Amino acid sequence: HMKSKLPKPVQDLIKMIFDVESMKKAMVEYEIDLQKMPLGKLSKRQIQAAYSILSEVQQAVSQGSDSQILDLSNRFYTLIPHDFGMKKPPLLNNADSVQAKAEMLDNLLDIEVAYSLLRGGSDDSSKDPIDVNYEKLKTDIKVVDRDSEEAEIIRKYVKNTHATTHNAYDLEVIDIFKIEREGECQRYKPFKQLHNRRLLWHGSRTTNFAGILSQGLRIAPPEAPVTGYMFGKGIYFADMVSKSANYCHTSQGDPIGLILLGEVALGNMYELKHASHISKLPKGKHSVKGLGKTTPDPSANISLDGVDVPLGTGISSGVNDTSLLYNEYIVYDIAQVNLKYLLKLKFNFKT
Numbered sequence: 001h002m003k004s005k006l007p008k009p010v011q012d013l014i015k016m017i018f019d020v021e022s023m024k025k026a027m028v029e030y031e032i033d034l035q036k037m038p039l040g041k042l043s044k045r046q047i048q049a050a051y052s053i054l055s056e057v058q059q060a061v062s063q064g065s066d067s068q069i070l071d072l073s074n075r076f077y078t079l080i081p082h083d084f085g086m087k088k089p090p091l092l093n094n095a096d097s098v099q100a101k102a103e104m105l106d107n108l109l110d111i112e113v114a115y116s117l118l119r120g121g122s123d124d125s126s127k128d129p130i131d132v133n134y135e136k137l138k139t140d141i142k143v144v145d146r147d148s149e150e151a152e153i154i155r156k157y158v159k160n161t162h163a164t165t166h167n168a169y170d171l172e173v174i175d176i177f178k179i180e181r182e183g184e185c186q187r188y189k190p191f192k193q194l195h196n197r198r199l200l201w202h203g204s205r206t207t208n209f210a211g212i213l214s215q216g217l218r219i220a221p222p223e224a225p226v227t228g229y230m231f232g233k234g235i236y237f238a239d240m241v242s243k244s245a246n247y248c249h250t251s252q253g254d255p256i257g258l259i260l261l262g263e264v265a266l267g268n269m270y271e272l273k274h275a276s277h278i279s280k281l282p283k284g285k286h287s288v289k290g291l292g293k294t295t296p297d298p299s300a301n302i303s304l305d306g307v308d309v310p311l312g313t314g315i316s317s318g319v320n321d322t323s324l325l326y327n328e329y330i331v332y333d334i335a336q337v338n339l340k341y342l343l344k345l346k347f348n349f350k351t
């Protein structure tokens with residue numbers, strides 16, 4: 001084949017995210033039986049059916065028996081075969097059960113997209129599959145020069161926002177990509193001048209990124225239990241790189257991860273200290289801010305192409321009795337996010 005003219009870092013990026021073995025590895029991590037539910041059998045309608053049962057389970061939890069909880073638990077495992085042998089799976093009887101399975105199903109929606117891109121489309125042996133797969137993403141991906149101002153700013157953001165309670169590892173930036181998803185700037189237009197636009201982190205596991213690049217960040221579907229998420233069904237962001245880096249789920253067994261920087265239009269924030277499982281905002285609000293005990297120092301704010309970058313070192317917010325150590329930001333309209341960069345990071349585990 002024609003061997004591909006993309007920069008090496010972009011080629012390695014494409015390789016990372018279309019890797020089928022990594023998809024399978026995520027699936028066995030969630031304890032999915034690949035014999036009964038293989039990658040090629042994953043479907044949106046089965047995932048949705050499973051979210052519905054999970055909603056039924058949330059119901060029965062909110063209103064207190066181990067009798068009835070069993071039936072519902074079993075129905076969930078019927079739709080998403082798990083790896084338990086001649087079994088009796090564990091009972092899904094609490095809110096952690098519901099959170100953990102909802103998060104798993106969210107992930108499967110991204111994995112199904114990646115796999116379906118990989119298996120739809122056309123097969124031409126005279127083309128580099130790196131080029132073929134790049135094209136499937138409908139995203140322009142550039143290498144940001146190590147020496148530019150934007151790279152300096154981004155590297156300072158990484159450097160200053162690593163939380164002390166997340167110090168079992170530290171981070172090196174391997175590559176910085178400037179990314180532009182087709183149509184997304186257009187989607188963003190009504191928000192592009194809202195007040196309180198901010199450049200924020202979103203980390204995810206590398207097997208989500210084909211999904212994220214091809215479809216954007218998305219909100220969980222109507223079947224998903226709103227209770228499965230601390231601030232209900234929106235798109236979540238952090239201002240501390242280490243908070244988002246934790247969602248990469250890297251390890252000694254795989255210490256390379258990916259994390260996004262997005263322009264997020266926050267406008268009038270609804271400030272909350274504790275769980276609130278909503279699907280719509282009260283009138284007048286554009287986002288939720290989960291108030292952290294620690295914040296990047298407000299006076300160290302820098303502007304990048306007109307957007308605030310909260311890269312100050314962590315100081316006390318002053319906020320008293322909060323469920324959150326660090327800030328969280330949630331929007332409930334996909335159109336309020338314009339993805340700007342993708343970082344590839346090395347995690348150095350100090351354990």
Ligand SMILES: C[C@@H]1Oc2ccc(CN3CC=C(c4ccc(Cl)cc4)CC3)cc2NC1=O
Nearest residue numbers: 106109202203218219220236237238244247
């Ligand atoms: C700070 C922020 O917090 C997170 C919370 C949850 C995730 C995991 N993602 C997994 C799957 C998602 C998804 C996929 C497809 C659809 Cl259709 C809807 C939602 C979005 C959520 C990551 C983060 N990362 C953070 O940094």
